[PDB]
Design an enzyme around this catalytic site. Structure first.
Site, PDB file in Angstrom:
ATOM      1  N   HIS A  35       0.812  -1.246   0.000  1.00 59.82           N
ATOM      2  CA  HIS A  35       0.000   0.000   0.000  1.00 59.82           C
ATOM      3  C   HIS A  35       0.827   1.269   0.000  1.00 59.82           C
ATOM      4  O   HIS A  35       0.223   2.363  -0.039  1.00 59.82           O
ATOM      5  CB  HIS A  35      -1.029   0.026   1.143  1.00 59.82           C
ATOM      6  CG  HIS A  35      -0.464   0.089   2.542  1.00 59.82           C
ATOM      7  ND1 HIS A  35       0.074   1.237   3.084  1.00 59.82           N
ATOM      8  CD2 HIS A  35      -0.336  -0.867   3.499  1.00 59.82           C
ATOM      9  CE1 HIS A  35       0.474   1.002   4.320  1.00 59.82           C
ATOM     10  NE2 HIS A  35       0.212  -0.261   4.610  1.00 59.82           N
ATOM     11  N   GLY A 137       2.563   3.725  14.200  1.00 58.90           N
ATOM     12  CA  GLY A 137       3.339   4.416  13.189  1.00 58.90           C
ATOM     13  C   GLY A 137       4.489   3.616  12.614  1.00 58.90           C
ATOM     14  O   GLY A 137       5.365   4.187  11.972  1.00 58.90           O
ATOM     15  N   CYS A 139       4.642   1.151  10.347  1.00 59.67           N
ATOM     16  CA  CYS A 139       4.227   0.328   9.215  1.00 59.67           C
ATOM     17  C   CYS A 139       5.440  -0.202   8.459  1.00 59.67           C
ATOM     18  O   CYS A 139       6.381   0.543   8.197  1.00 59.67           O
ATOM     19  CB  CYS A 139       3.359   1.176   8.280  1.00 59.67           C
ATOM     20  SG  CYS A 139       2.764   0.218   6.996  1.00 59.67           S
TER      21      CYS A 139
END
EC number: 3.4.19.12
Length: 183
Positions: A35, A137, A139
């Site tokens: 993503h 946070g 990722c």
């Protein structure tokens, strides 16, 4: 937790447009959540195949510390993007990819923007989520176990769910649990 030195040397930052997250650099491939190619509007019903065909190698900025790595190819494997770079990581450890299950412990190296912040022991709950603010946070951070001299990578963080728990995939890009990478 396991000592993190062998995994610290593999963490990079990946930036595509205005999205930056962590990636894992082994040999000459960087792995990261697919993503990264999405904008905010895109995340509601992303068409990852159509999004990827419009991206060129130069749209991906990969940094290992202060060094930019040049991307020379890109492909999708399930939910993980594989960026081929023109430099093999000289700190690549002996490694394998394994798929685990809830309740099995592993260590996660939480990073911010490719920089290691902390290492934590955790396990997935029976519903395949992780509860824990150490992944906030972070990722693209990865989970691993160490067996003598071999690192077994078993997890990549992809998203924080609306309920405040975390979902992720194995390193073949298959989710743990019934989650999808869209909001």
């Amino acid at each position: 937790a396991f000592p993190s030195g062998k995994v610290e040397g593999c963490m990079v930052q990946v930036t595509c447009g205005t999205t930056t997250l962590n990636g894992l650099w082994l040999d000459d491939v960087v792995y990261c959540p697919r993503h990264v190619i999405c904008t905010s509007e895109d995340m509601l019903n992303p068409n990852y195949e159509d999004l990827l065909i419009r991206k060129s190698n130069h749209n991906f900025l990969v940094q290992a510390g202060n060094v930019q790595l040049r991307v020379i190819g890109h492909s999708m494997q399930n939910c993980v993007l594989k960026l081929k770079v023109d430099t093999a990581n000289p700190k690549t450890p002996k490694y394998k990819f394994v798929r685990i299950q809830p309740g099995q412990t592993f260590s996660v190296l939480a990073c911010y923007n490719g920089s290691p912040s902390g290492v934590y022991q955790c396990a997935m709950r029976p519903n395949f989520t992780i509860k824990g603010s150490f992944l906030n946070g972070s990722c693209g951070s990865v989970g691993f176990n160490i067996d003598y001299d071999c690192v077994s990578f078993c997890y990549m963080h992809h998203m924080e769910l609306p309920t405040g728990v975390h979902a992720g995939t194995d390193l073949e890009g298959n989710f743990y649990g019934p989650f999808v990478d869209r909001q």
